[PDB]
Structure formats: C-alpha cells, structure tokens
Design a protein around this ligand. Sequence first.
Ligand SMILES: [Cl-]
Lengths: 111, 107, 4, 4, 4
Amino acid sequence: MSEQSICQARAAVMVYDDANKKWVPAGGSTGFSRVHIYHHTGNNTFRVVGRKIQDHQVVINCAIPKGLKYNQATQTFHQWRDARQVYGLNFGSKEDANVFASAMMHALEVL
Amino acid sequence: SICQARAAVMVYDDANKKWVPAGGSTGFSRVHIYHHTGNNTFRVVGRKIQDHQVVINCAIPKGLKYNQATQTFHQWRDARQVYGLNFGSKEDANVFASAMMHALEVL
Amino acid sequence: XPPX
Amino acid sequence: XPPX
Amino acid sequence: XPPX
Ligand SMILES: [Cl-]
C-alpha cells in the first residue's frame, strides 16, 4: 500500500569513511535507529529505510538491487556496498541481526 | 564516448579474496566512458582487444566513489561486486580518471 | 568489504 | 577498498 | 517514511 514492511530491527546505522578508514554514524550522530526492509509489490523492488529513535532522522534510504552481496561480517554487524558508500548495521542484539538478515536473504532470493 | 583507455578489467572475487579477470578471460580491454546526451547519463563499457568480448557495462550513478588506489589501478564499488582497472600506463590512467572525475561533476 |  |  |  504500496510498500510492505517485511522486517524491522534496531540497529546503529553506519557508513564507512574511506579516507579515514573508520566507520561513522550515518546522518552524523550516534544512536540507534529502527531499520526496515520495505517491499514494493507492484514493481517487486526492495529498499532499506531507517529512522533514528530519538529524533526521527531518516538515516538510510537505499535500494536493494538484484545481485547485492550482503556480508554478515559478525553476528551483530552486517554490511553491503553501493557506488557511493558502504553501509553497515550495528544491531542492538543478535536477535535483531537475525530477523533482519533473514528478510534480506529472502529479498535477494526473490529479486 | 568521452574517453578510451587500455586496461585489464578486473572484478573482486569476494569468496576467494582475489581479483579475477572480468568476464573470465585474461587480457587487455579498451575501456570507454559513454555519455548519453539525451539523458545526461554515463556508463563504463569495455571490450577485450583480442576477441571483443564485452567484459564490463556499468552505469556511473551520481555520487560514485572512484578510488585511485595507485597511479595505474583504480577501482569502484557497486552492490554486486568491486570493479578494478589495471591500466597499461600512467597516461591511460590519468585520461580515464580525468573523464570519470568530470562525468561525476556534471551528474 | 571493509572490516567491522 | 580491496588492495591491488 | 519518504519515498524511495
Ligand atoms: Cl571504525
């Protein structure tokens, strides 16, 4: 209607700062976000969208293209690439990580 | 075509932590940046010199990070894989990067 | 990918 | 970025 | 959420 949330997880959204070889908080400030995968049924597309809990900042809004490689680097830190940045999710718990990864793996299968 | 350069086109094999030749075939390619003027879009296209196999055909989106790792090996990411160009010379590298850096400015 |  |  |  026109998108369905196929999962939600609590995570600190990060992007990799290539110049300084460090992870930084997406959107410029620390704190946890609520991160969803949304599925547009009409076009069979997916995206990751997340808002900071404390102040509702949109900190991630990125398409999940067919063929994306989703790297589960650790049980609570998962990451993927796009042309502009590497995104990372530092999950609040192993359970949050698992629910999100399960949905991501499903999306990538049906793309 | 806004540029042409001679390079070995590579992709990173995530599983084996190594670069492999794009398309499965070793050898040099002629690598272009193409400009669609009707849409103001760019893409990278490369053909094996020896047998003209097309080994890369990649859009250049706004915001792409193009990394000049060395004077002759440049690289960039997309969701599916990391691309590398191992240029035959510093001159080929600079011609291609100059065009890339210009394309990225005008997107 | 980068390390964590 | 992976090294060369 | 905003559109894609
Ligand atoms: Cl770090």
